[PDB]
Curated annotation (Swiss-Prot):
Post-translational modification: Palmitoylated. Palmitoylation is required for targeting to postsynaptic density, plasma membrane and synapses. Palmitoylation by ZDHHC2 occurs when the synaptic activity decreases and induces DLG4 synaptic clustering. Palmitoylation by ZDHHC15 regulates trafficking to the postsynaptic density and function in synaptogenesis. Palmitoylation may play a role in glutamate receptor GRIA1 synapse clustering. Depalmitoylated by ABHD17A and ABHD17B and to a lesser extent by ABHD17C, ABHD12, ABHD13, LYPLA1 and LYPLA2. Ubiquitinated by MDM2 in response to NMDA receptor activation, leading to proteasome-mediated degradation of DLG4 which is required for AMPA receptor endocytosis.
Protein name (database record): Disks large homolog 4
First and last residues shown, out of full length: 307 to 403 of 724
Recorded disease: Intellectual developmental disorder, autosomal dominant 62: An autosomal dominant form of intellectual disability, a disorder characterized by significantly below average general intellectual functioning associated with impairments in adaptive behavior and manifested during the developmental period. MRD62 is characterized by mild to moderately impaired intellectual development.
Tissue expr: Brain.
Coiled coil residues, start to end: none
Amino acid sequence: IPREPRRIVIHRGSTGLGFNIVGGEGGEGIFISFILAGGPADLSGELRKGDQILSVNGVDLRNASHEQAAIALKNAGQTVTIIAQYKPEEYSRFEAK
């Protein structure tokens, strides 16, 4: 699985973007914690649980809190560009064992 940043385009559905995010306050990162099967984000493996969302459209989320990121993902439009980077090592600290 590539570890360099990846560009994914999502088309918002009648339920949102099809994934959940985990994070916290500013700086802990925004990570994909769940991807809905058949949802807008289920794109033949292009997005992965454990991806860090580096940005959404023009909005940098590397340093955003969870509350900021949630707001940005909802105001992102019907066509959404996600820059994702696989970092399961960093993500693992958010996921209960």
